[PDB]
Amino acid sequence: SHMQTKIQKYAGEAMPYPNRTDSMTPFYINHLGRHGARFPTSRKALDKVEKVLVSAQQENGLTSEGMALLSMIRRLSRLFDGQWGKLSKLGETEQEGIAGRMIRNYPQLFSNSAKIEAIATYVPRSINSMDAFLSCMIRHNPALQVQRSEGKQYNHILRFFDLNKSYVNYKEKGDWLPIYKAFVHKKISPVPIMKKFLLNPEQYLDKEAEEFVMALFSVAAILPDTSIPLNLEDLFTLDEWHRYWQTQNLRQYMSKSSAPVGKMLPVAIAWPLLSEFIRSAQEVISGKSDYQANFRFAHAETVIPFVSLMGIEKTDVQVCRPDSVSVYWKDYEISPMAANVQWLFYRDRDQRIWVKILLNEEAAALPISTACFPYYSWEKTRIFFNQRIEMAKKTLSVFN
């Protein structure tokens, strides 16, 4: 159903990884993946929802459906306790699917004693995503050679968003905040939502009504990622979900991607990862390294600026009007749960090197020419990416 699939997309970066299907041969794959589907990282939203409803209950201020909601919210509070931030069973199955399609699409690459390496951040959901992926690989071919490592040693290339002080200050106190807050006030209409659950929803101040509805949407959007057989998605109409998604999409865009208000600083910080991607591919192309694949497991905050810095079409647009962002930049197409980028390298009969870029396993476009899309000349692509890195260094230098 097109309605339900749109509602799923409106979970934004909480969307589960989309359904994908099986199907020359590459000689190397260069990968970055976000962890799979996870529990919420913060209790603040669930606590806010429960507090509003519990106060209403003590005032006899709940509708029938509001009583049902409170009952569910109390259950979720018990089921989320001790699980915050963790990879769910669905997250593991997402990684098994990505690895499985890779192996079945390119068996010769992972055959015999092929060598692979994987790295992850220190965050457990990313480590455990890497292990779900690797375990799938090893099950299919136990004769793989596998190097596995993880931790803060990879912060410079996988968690660069924590290391640049100017970006940390922008994320925490930058000029995107008043734009976001004004957009939330314009887009979010709380009274229709709160009328479902609360008697006298008009007595609530606009600010607290806004906060409650935002928190409730947050809970409903993450529940499909938890492997728990409960659902809040139907509480809301497609238009209500669309409005919520527009606000969070704008937040993600302005805080982490190519919005003009950010001056490309949120994108420029990713250049060390793009540099390391090029270096690992060049070492394999030359024969200095003989890995068949490099895998990397990290975060949406890794994937989003990395994709923008590559210049994948529709991901580095600099949209002048905040209200227009949702038309031109869609976070659920870039960084859903288990979001991943794969560079597939090919050698043709005349030994020329070609690269295909997959974003969530679909061919991605770059703003350079090729006569055989989706395959790009590696020489042309490397030169383009190196120009992106040089641009990124300049951007960082204009902001200390």
Backbone angles phi, psi at 338, to 5 degrees: 60, 15
> For strand 28-34 and strand 293-298, is the pairing parallel, antiparallel, or unpaired?
parallel
Number of Cβ atoms within 10 Å of the Cβ of 199: 14
What is the Cα 378 distance to its own chain's centre? 26
Secondary structure (3-state) at 224: helix
DSSP for 235-285 reads GS-HHHHHHHHHHHHHHHHHHHS--GGGTTHHHHTTHHHHHHHHHHHHHHH
For residue 112, give the CATH number of its domain: 3.40.50.1240
The identity of residue 323, as a single letter, is D
Q: Tell me if 101 is assigned to some domain.
A: yes
DSSP for 60-103 reads T-B-HHHHHHHHHHHHHHHHHTT-TTPBPHHHHHHHHHHHHHHH
What is the Cα 88 distance to its own chain's centre? 16
Cβ neighbours for 124, distance < 8 A, ≥ 6 positions apart: 85, 86, 87
Residue 48 near residue 98 (C-beta atoms within 8 A): no
Secondary structure (3-state) at 363: strand
Rounded-to-10 torsion of CA 152, 156, 159, 161: 140
Q: Tell me if 145 is assigned to some domain.
A: yes
Secondary structure (3-state) at 375: strand
Dist. CA 25–CA 344, nearest whole Å: 9
Dist. CA 243–CA 248, nearest whole Å: 9
Residue 137 near residue 109 (C-beta atoms within 8 A): no
- Taking CA atoms, 343 is separated from 28, 273, 375, in Å, by 8, 13, 10
DSSP for 306-324 reads HHHHHT-TTTS---S-GGG
Secondary structure (3-state) at 231: coil
Give the containing element (helix H, strand E) for 294. Answer: strand 293-298
287 dihedral zone (left: phi>0; alpha: psi -120 to 50; beta): left
This structure's resolution (Å) is 1.5
Give the pair of three-digit tokens for residue 295.
């895998």
- Please, how many CA atoms are within 13 Å of residue 13, restricted to the half-sphere of its CB? 22
Residue with tokens 């990124």: 392
Give the pair of three-digit tokens for residue 103.
């192996």
Dist. CA 338–CA 199, nearest whole Å: 40
Dist. CA 305–CA 272, nearest whole Å: 11
- Per the structure, the count of domains in the chain is 1
Q: Tell me if 155 is assigned to some domain.
A: yes
Backbone angles phi, psi at 91, to 5 degrees: -60, -40
Please calculate the CA angle 103-107-113 and round it to the nearest 5 degrees: 100
Give the pair of three-digit tokens for residue 286.
């030359």
Give the pair of three-digit tokens for residue 20.
């994908």
**Runs of H (alpha helix) within the chain:** 2-9, 44-58, 64-80, 89-105, 124-140, 155-158, 165-173, 176-187, 190-194, 206-222, 238-256, 265-268, 271-286, 300-310, 325-328, 331-334, 378-397
Dist. CA 322–CA 249, nearest whole Å: 10
Residue with tokens 């030359």: 286
Give the pair of three-digit tokens for residue 394.
């300049």
Give the pair of three-digit tokens for residue 155.
């912060």
Give the pair of three-digit tokens for residue 34.
């976000």
- Please, how many CA atoms are within 13 Å of residue 260, restricted to the half-sphere of its CB? 8
Q: Tell me if 212 is assigned to some domain.
A: no
Residue 355 near residue 378 (C-beta atoms within 8 A): yes
Q: Tell me if 290 is assigned to some domain.
A: yes
> For strand 115-120 and strand 293-298, is the pairing parallel, antiparallel, or unpaired?
parallel
Q: Tell me if 330 is assigned to some domain.
A: yes
- Closest to 340 measured CA to CA, from 311, 366, 306: 306
Gaps in the chain with C–N over 2.5 Å, residue before each: 23
Q: Tell me if 329 is assigned to some domain.
A: yes
- Please, how many CA atoms are within 13 Å of residue 172, restricted to the half-sphere of its CB? 8
Q: Tell me if 247 is assigned to some domain.
A: yes
Q: Which domain holds residue 28?
A: 2-36+84-175+238-397
Residue 356 near residue 344 (C-beta atoms within 8 A): yes
What is the Cα 164 distance to its own chain's centre? 20
Q: Can you state the angle between helices 271-286 and 300-310, rounded to 10 degrees?
A: 70
Dist. CA 160–CA 20, nearest whole Å: 30
Give the pair of three-digit tokens for residue 274.
């793009």
Is the bond preceding residue 374 a cis peptide, omega within 30 degrees?
yes
Q: Which residues pair with 150 in a beta bridge?
A: 120
